[PDB]
Amino acid sequence: YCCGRKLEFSPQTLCCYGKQLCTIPRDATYYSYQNRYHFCEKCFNEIQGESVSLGDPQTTINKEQFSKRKNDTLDPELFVECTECGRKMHQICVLHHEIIWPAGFVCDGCLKKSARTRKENKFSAKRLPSTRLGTFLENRVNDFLRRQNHPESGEVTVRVVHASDKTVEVKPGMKARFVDSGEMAESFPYRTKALFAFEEIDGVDLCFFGMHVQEYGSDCPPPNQRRVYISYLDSVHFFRPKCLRTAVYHEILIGYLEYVKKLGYTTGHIWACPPSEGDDYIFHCHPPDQKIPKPKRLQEWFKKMLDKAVSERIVHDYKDIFKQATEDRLTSAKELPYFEGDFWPNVLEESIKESGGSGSQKLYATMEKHKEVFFVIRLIAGPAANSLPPIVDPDPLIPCDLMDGRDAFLTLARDKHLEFSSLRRAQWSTMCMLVELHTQSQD
Ligand SMILES: COc1ccc(C2(C(=O)N3C[C@H](F)C[C@@H]3C(=O)Nc3ccc4[nH]ncc4n3)CCCCC2)cc1
Ligand SMILES: [Zn+2]
Ligand SMILES: [Zn+2]
Ligand SMILES: [Zn+2]
């Protein structure tokens, strides 16, 4: 071997299908049917008798048709063979990708000896199509890095890899309360964008940061107009050097707020919510020693980022949702911004049901309960906010199914055994992710 290391992939967490958002973690017992429908033991034993309705229509399958197993299968890492010396090498170690170098793998010893070099990887992060937004962000990050003069830092590339039109539909409880009486729009149009930051470490790209956002333009009816909502943020903690990692995250996030403020978006919204254990927002299979922040520390992290943005004159100010509503003299749930997949649409469904039909009953109490978790970020304030021209985004749409939401990228990593759990594995996953973004765009 190369490293002389016996390497195998770790078992990944699956879903249990018999409960919304349930999972089966490493080294857990589970029941599976056709390697497709998996059940945690609890979700299995809570099924009535021996009849499970399956599908994705209904197919009643008996319970004795399942296999009982433990989630502990260890797939060995793959090797590749040098087409000349026949040396066997971990594919991840040498980062050989059949699509980048179709003519076969040639080890570095055979390359140095013959004074040869690998043909250039034209499937790099750098060569992903650029945008006004991505350029604005990466200029900000690289200018910051060069101001720091740290010998270990590498060039950072920021790329927007998806942009498409969407709408968020008001859920049935709030629909029956406010939409059917005509007090609230039934849906809100927005544009979603996915963007990623890469760092060149030793001429090798590493994806270390990802973001999905929802941008509601000047055409959106209230209460959603001229607002951006950050759907998901994620990172892989291998940015080099470690002591600039947080500042780089801040530069990206503050730069994005600066950018949308320039286009005319008045307000930013952040739900400071950690993932639960074993759940990946964007990047599949995080490093074990990269810890999920607990809520209070995630909140303070966002507070520090926003405070720097305020002192930079980018953010005017920010408040929690409870304080924001009080100053806005809010009286009804219909006045709250209604975002896709956000907490408040879900809690308002439950609030209306438990109150027997009111849409204002526990509103302020619920906002006070959770206020520390919801940031309302004022970008454009006072009289300037009233006379704004239409929002015209210079960047075009970018159709890319792999990056339409977070799910397709998690599925690709699952299907191709990609992990972001170590530097070597995250570099390999970055290479495969880059190849996929380049080939999908070719179509
Ligand atoms: C105080 O400390 C922090 C460490 C990282 C962050 C950020 C961040 O990345 N995250 C916040 C959420 F927590 C999701 C993601 C995260 O930790 N995601 C992880 C991390 C480890 C994981 N293991 N398993 C899953 C899993 N998800 C860094 C990039 C910009 C967003 C804020 C913020 C604070
Ligand atoms: Zn190796
Ligand atoms: Zn379960
Ligand atoms: Zn060789």
UniProtKB/Swiss-Prot annotation:
Outcome reported for the amino acid change (mutating residue 231 to R): Loss of activity
Domain CBP/p300-type HAT: 122-442
Localization: Cytoplasm; Nucleus; Chromosome
Effect of residue 192 to L: 40% decrease in activity
Region of interest called Interaction with histone, as start-end residue ranges on this chain: 232-234
Result when mutating residue 234 to Y: Abolished acetyltransferase and acyltransferase activities. Abolishes autoacetylation. Does not interact with TFAP2A and inhibits transcriptional coactivation of TFAP2A by CITED2
Top-rank taxon, per record: Eukaryota
Binding residues annotated for acetyl-CoA, in chain numbering: 233-235, 245-246, 292, 297, 301
Record's comment on post-translational modification: Acetylated on Lys at up to 17 positions by intermolecular autocatalysis. Sumoylated; sumoylation in the transcriptional repression domain (CRD1) mediates transcriptional repression. Desumoylated by SENP3 through the removal of SUMO2 and SUMO3.
Phenotype when changing residue 339 to A: Abolished acetyltransferase activity
Chain positions found as N6-acetyllysine: 19, 171, 308, 334, 362
Quaternary structure, from the entry: Interacts with HIF1A; the interaction is stimulated in response to hypoxia and inhibited by CITED2. Probably part of a complex with HIF1A and CREBBP. Interacts (via N-terminus) with TFAP2A (via N-terminus); the interaction requires CITED2. Interacts (via CH1 domain) with CITED2 (via C-terminus). Interacts with CITED1 (unphosphorylated form preferentially and via C-terminus). Interacts with ESR1; the interaction is estrogen-dependent and enhanced by CITED1. Interacts with HIPK2. (Microbial infection) Interacts with human adenovirus 5 E1A protein; this interaction stimulates the acetylation of RB1 by recruiting EP300 and RB1 into a multimeric-protein complex.
Summary of the function given for this chain in its UniProt record: Functions as a histone acetyltransferase and regulates transcription via chromatin remodeling. Acetylates all four core histones in nucleosomes. Histone acetylation gives an epigenetic tag for transcriptional activation. Mediates acetylation of histone H3 at 'Lys-122' (H3K122ac), a modification that localizes at the surface of the histone octamer and stimulates transcription, possibly by promoting nucleosome instability. Mediates acetylation of histone H3 at 'Lys-18' and 'Lys-27' (H3K18ac and H3K27ac, respectively).
Disease linkage: Defects in EP300 may play a role in epithelial cancer. Chromosomal aberrations involving EP300 may be a cause of acute myeloid leukemias. Translocation t(8;22)(p11;q13) with KAT6A.
Swiss-Prot/TrEMBL domain comment: The CRD1 domain (cell cycle regulatory domain 1) mediates transcriptional repression of a subset of p300 responsive genes; it can be de-repressed by CDKN1A/p21WAF1 at least at some promoters. It contains sumoylation and acetylation sites and the same lysine residues may be targeted for the respective modifications. It is proposed that deacetylation by SIRT1 allows sumoylation leading to suppressed activity.
Protein's UniProt name: Histone acetyltransferase p300
Record lineage: Eukaryota, Metazoa, Chordata, Craniata, Vertebrata
Residues included from the entire protein: 1162 to 1664 of 2414
